[PDB]
Design a binder for this molecule. Structure first.
Ligand code: CL
Ligand code: CL
Ligand code: CL
Ligand code: CL
Ligand code: MG
Ligand code: MG
Ligand code: MG
Lengths: 238, 239
């Protein structure tokens, strides 16, 4: 009753010769839905969805002063054109600028990063590996249901200031029109791709967390596209 | 120069057989642009654009606890269907739900309202009339450039209210967002004129805008956004 399985959504993954899970949470009804109950609770690397807690920690420790502070390009020409420029928290989130967040993580340091993830109840709370890459290739793991962390963020219940939480929710802003607002973050670890966040409507909020097998970055647009198809199927968005 | 007049934009108004002003402010360059410097400084009733300062004050005084608090419909059936229901701050600003803001204003009260508009440097700072209708039929007046000035303070958290209040109101002003830009803004209509004021966030800049236009009928209200967007598009601010 609290959780309900809907395998019809599998078609949206197999339509694209893929495999994955979408988890939805209806906040007003306190009811969850997914196409795959097992996979909804399997833990994966968070990859760049880790930018959500990393941002909160950087803000609350004063590593980042506000969303306007500029992190200047380090002058290394990288493969992603939008990384080769100055950023602030907003644009760094938007373009998933790993080198900016690696600098945050080094400033934060291991002892504080670990304490804060413990305080967040975030995934397996394990930062084994490099302090500035463990969310990409170290020991940290989180499941889709565990990402649905987001409910605490939404309600300002995380163990960081309300201000830090409002700034990160602002930075997560992805889309808005007269029908809905999406606040979310993508991630990709070269094997699975993520999209996690929520959809704000006039009278409700739907939290989502999706991950999918993702051999190639050619199909990264499928993270949003598959998720939106489910949302349209469920009459959450038009 | 700091201000430049671009009368080519008059084309966007006349092509819809109306008259009005658009003011733009390029924050990076600290430069302003308008089709009409005189109308840019003409002070009008703010109408529902007053919901921005009203929200700020209601939040800072704790009249509104946060953006999720529900304000129950009072049960009076009004002419606007979306008004005949429960609202929170977000939906009340979205649907310009006058009666909800009238209740805010009555609880703020005239002394605190007057004091905070002075602290805000808002328009002519005049709240004469009823405390719960003066922005619709009373003495307060604000010009397009004054709107820009006020919005720049809000953007930068420089208004004399808490940073929290300012962040919540900027959230409530969210109108549109895609991969290219974010618009935070508020419409207004006082039966004779229509407004649209706010700003456009880009990756590397912010453009503030304030527009108003003659509005003899409610049929043309969509022209407030349409005209403003045509100008933004002309200036390659948005695609
Ligand atoms: Cl926002
Ligand atoms: Cl990504
Ligand atoms: Cl420029
Ligand atoms: Cl609005
Ligand atoms: Mg680079
Ligand atoms: Mg280790
Ligand atoms: Mg409501």
């Amino acid at each position: 009753k609290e959780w309900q399985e809907n395998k019809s959504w599998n078609a949206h993954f197999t339509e694209h010769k893929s495999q994955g899970v979408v988890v939805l949470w209806n906040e007003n009804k306190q009811q969850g839905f997914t196409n795959n109950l097992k996979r909804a609770n399997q833990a994966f690397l968070p990859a760049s969805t880790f930018k959500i807690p990393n941002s909160l920690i950087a803000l609350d420790l004063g590593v980042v002063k506000d969303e306007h502070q500029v992190f200047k390009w380090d002058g290394q020409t990288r493969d992603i054109a939008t990384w080769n420029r100055d950023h602030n928290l907003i644009t760094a989130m938007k373009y998933s600028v790993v080198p900016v967040y690696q600098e945050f993580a080094r400033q934060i340091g291991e002892a504080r990063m670990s304490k804060m993830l413990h305080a967040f109840d975030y995934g397996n709370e394990d930062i084994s590996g490099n302090v500035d890459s463990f969310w990409l290739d170290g020991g940290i793991r989180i499941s889709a249901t565990e990402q649905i962390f987001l409910r605490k963020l939404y309600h300002n219940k995380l163990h960081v200031s309300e201000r830090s939480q409002r700034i990160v929710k602002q930075a997560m802003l992805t889309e808005a029109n007269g029908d809905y607002i999406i606040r979310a973050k993508t991630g990709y670890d070269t094997k699975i791709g993520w999209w996690v966040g929520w959809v704000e409507l006039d009278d409700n909020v739907w939290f989502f967390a999706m991950n999918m097998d993702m051999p190639t970055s050619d199909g990264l647009g499928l993270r949003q596209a598959i998720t939106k198809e489910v949302l349209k199927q469920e009459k959450i968005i038009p």
